[PDB]
């Protein structure tokens, strides 16, 4: 065979030649043998692509190896390799490129890898949270397509328990002002974040958030590898757990595994139904392989269960599965490993774990809040509403049994007439509803800051303006839209409301 590879330096080329020669010595082709070749990247792209096309396709190469140079250009190595490989629908192997935009087998019709991109390690999040009594995550994600994929994967890998994350708020990639997201995040009972995004934005959010003291006691943070890197291990408050992979930028092992897989696939494919030959020359032929999908399909079906990196098991989307990761604690700016990821199992090490704050416990991302803001609409017979006078309280009125009327302020609107803006004047609502309100408030021992709603309706279900997307407006709507928990008022139990919500047992009959 005449396999081809695109490398960064000559030691890499020598290593590749040694690996393919060792593969031949262990097991080799009958007559075609295993010839090999490696070239070097050029910082011209267009000319590097011209070079790889001409030379490699003229070389009758059967597999193409591409490795990410350690230089962080991020669109240097795999950007022209997979495209022109797919022009002839010939598969490529990934060595040290670990983004997830390539995992989508749509445009890069040919792409493999042995470095599970950063969407994979989102699986580690559930692989751990399976048994931790951790049930409230408001994780932040950037607008990068990597972050997009990691997000969607995390939502879809959590529905097996039918649970749901609270906030999945998101932000533009690599910005320098993220304080907002944070002070709305802190005004939530939830106290866990699984933010995982670009390193620069990670440092930005750390710097802007530590000012808000949310890094203090009982507020954990969850972050993966690439988000603690270069400019991020600095601003990190203690306790930030790190999630990293076992075999890092060691090219040799991955070159070995890739060439072993390619050699095994070609040797088994030497016997097959029909094997055609690559078109000769980058120019000329304008037609695809007659058998390229055969080579690719047998390449996914590759159980190469022997290697330096163990079993290089590949998943369905042309990537690598069955990887080993690491949970590592950040102990006083001195990072040391704190967990292991052998896959579907966790074996925490015998160490003194540390969180932010400084307690040595299981900080609760959950809370009782005990605020319970209340809303209610004024009909008439169950709530009497009176504009309180300029006296700081409602009034004092009495009853027959010597029991005066309870009265509390009610921060309702003042826009009953359409067009007038809601002055939100603090009127005084009272009566039957306030009576049940105060009794139940004493029952549960909390506080209320009651206020009405602007529109003044029960808020049925309807459609948004000129669209088939449905919604709930009005009072029920402000219940759903996390604006208050209790809306106690005369509201009818019906079907469409109860089909997707839960009601207390009724307190009346009508």
């Amino acid at each position: 065979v005449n396999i081809g590879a695109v490398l960064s330096t000559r030691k890499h080329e020598q290593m590749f030649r040694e690996a393919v020669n060792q593969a031949n010595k262990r097991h080799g082709s009958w007559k075609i043998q295993l010839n090999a070749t490696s070239v070097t990247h050029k910082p011209n792209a267009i000319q590097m692509a011209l070079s790889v096309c001409e030379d490699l396709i003229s070389s009758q190469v059967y597999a193409i190896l591409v490795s990410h140079p350690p230089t962080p250009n991020d669109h240097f190595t795999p950007t022209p390799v997979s495209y022109t490989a797919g022009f002839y629908r010939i598969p490529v192997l990934g060595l040290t490129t670990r983004m997830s935009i390539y995992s989508d087998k749509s445009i890069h019709l040919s792409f493999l890898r042995t470095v599970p991109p950063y969407s994979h390690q989102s699986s580690v999040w559930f692989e751990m949270m399976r048994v931790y009594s951790w049930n409230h995550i408001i994780l932040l994600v950037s607008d990068d397509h990597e972050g997009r994929a990691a997000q969607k994967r995390l939502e879809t890998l959590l529905e097996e328990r039918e649970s749901k994350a609270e906030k999945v708020l998101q932000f533009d990639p690599g910005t320098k002002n993220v304080t907002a997201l944070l002070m709305e995040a802190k005004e939530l009972e939830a106290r866990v974040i699984i933010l995982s995004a670009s390193e620069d934005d990670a440092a930005t959010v750390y710097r802007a958030a530590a000012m808000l003291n949310m890094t203090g006691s009982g507020y954990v943070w969850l972050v993966g590898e690439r988000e603690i890197s270069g400019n991020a291990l600095r601003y990190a408050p203690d306790g930030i757990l790190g999630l990293q992979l076992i075999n890092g930028k060691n090219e040799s092992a991955h070159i070995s595994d890739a060439v072993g897989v390619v050699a095994q696939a070609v040797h088994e494919l030497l016997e097959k139904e029909n094997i055609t030959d690559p078109p000769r020359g980058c120019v000329g032929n304008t037609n695809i392989w007659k058998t390229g999908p055969l080579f690719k399909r047998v390449l996914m079906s590759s159980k190469y269960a022997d290697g330096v990196t163990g079993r290089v098991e590949f998943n369905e989307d042309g990537d690598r599965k069955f990887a080993n990761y690491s949970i590592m604690n950040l102990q006083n700016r001195k990072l040391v490993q704190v967990g292991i990821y052998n896959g579907t199992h966790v074996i925490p090490n015998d160490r003194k774990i540390i969180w932010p704050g400084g307690e040595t416990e299981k900080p609760r991302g959950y809370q009782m809040s005990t605020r319970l803001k209340i809303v209610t609409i004024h009909q008439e017979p169950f709530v009497y509403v009176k504009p309180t006078l300029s006296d700081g309280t409602c009034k004092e009125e009495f009853t027959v049994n010597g029991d005066p009327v309870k009265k509390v302020i009610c921060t309702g609107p003042n826009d009953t007439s359409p067009g007038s803006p809601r002055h939100t004047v603090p009127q005084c609502c009272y009566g039957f509803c306030i009576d049940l309100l105060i009794k139940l408030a004493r029952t549960m021992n909390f506080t209320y800051e009651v206020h009405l709603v602007a529109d003044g309706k029960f808020g049925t279900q309807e459609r948004v303006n000129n669209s088939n997307k449905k919604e709930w407006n009005g009072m029920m709507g402000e219940l759903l839209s996390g604006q208050a928990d209790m809306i106690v008022a005369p509201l009818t139990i019906n079907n469409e409301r109860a089909q997707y919500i839960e009601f207390s047992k009724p307190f009346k009959y009508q």
Epitope: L233, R333, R351
Partner: antibody
């Protein structure tokens, strides 16, 4: 809040020296660590390691299989168990407090002894 | 890891502005910062500037740190040279592996 390394000058070779460091004005039950950076004589410095009051510790990778440090709250003091002491210990030992903070850094150093084997 | 470089010393009269520059051998001085100690001869070390941005309580405005990160020279300034400043000046930094210290800097006034 003042440190003091107990062992003044015990420099017995081929043995297990035990320099014990205690503090006044406070106790170890806090969120901070401890430091025993070593100064070669007439030369620069040489970090040894650092310990935590409750569970863990960490040292310079230059010296791993030889340093074992413990801490006791009852005596409010912490000491090492260095094994097979050699002539390399001809260098002054210190005991400085540190602050976790945002940057690893020692609070002003201790009195320092003159332990040189 | 990575060592530093302060050759041995420097000598100048009061009224000048001269101080050694701590240099990071491997990598750049941008992630894990630098910090200068003052250690009077025959005595224990004590801080003089922290992260080369602010000075500890009691340290005069005479000392001030600055960062270039291009030559990786962690610059220190003792502008306002006088006599009492005779001590050792030790640059220190740190990483997930180790904390490392300078060779020392004792000036002649």
């Amino acid at each position: 809040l003042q440190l003091q390394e107990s062992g003044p000058g015990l420099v017995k070779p081929s043995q297990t020296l035990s320099l014990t460091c205690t503090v006044s004005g406070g106790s170890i039950s806090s969120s901070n660590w401890w430091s025993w950076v070593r100064q070669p004589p007439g030369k620069g410095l040489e970090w040894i390691g650092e310990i935590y009051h409750s569970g863990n510790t960490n040292y310079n990778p230059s010296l791993k299989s030889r340093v074992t440090v413990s801490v006791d709250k009852s005596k409010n003091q912490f000491s090492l168990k260095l094994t097979s002491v050699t002539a390399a210990d001809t260098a002054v030992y210190y005991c400085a407090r540190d602050v976790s903070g945002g940057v690893n850094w020692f609070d002003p150093w201790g009195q320092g002894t003159l332990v040189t084997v | 890891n990575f060592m530093l470089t302060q050759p041995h010393s420097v000598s100048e009269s009061p009224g000048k502005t001269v101080t050694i520059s701590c240099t990071r051998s491997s990598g750049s001085i941008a992630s894990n910062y630098v910090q200068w100690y003052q250690q009077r001869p025959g005595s224990a070390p004590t801080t003089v500037i922290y992260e080369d941005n602010q000075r500890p309580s009691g340290v005069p405005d005479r000392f001030s740190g600055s960062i270039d990160s291009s030559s990786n020279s962690a610059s220190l300034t003792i502008s306002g040279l006088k006599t009492e400043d005779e001590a050792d000046y030790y640059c220190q930094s740190y990483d997930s592996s180790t904390v490392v210290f300078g060779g020392g800097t004792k000036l002649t006034v």
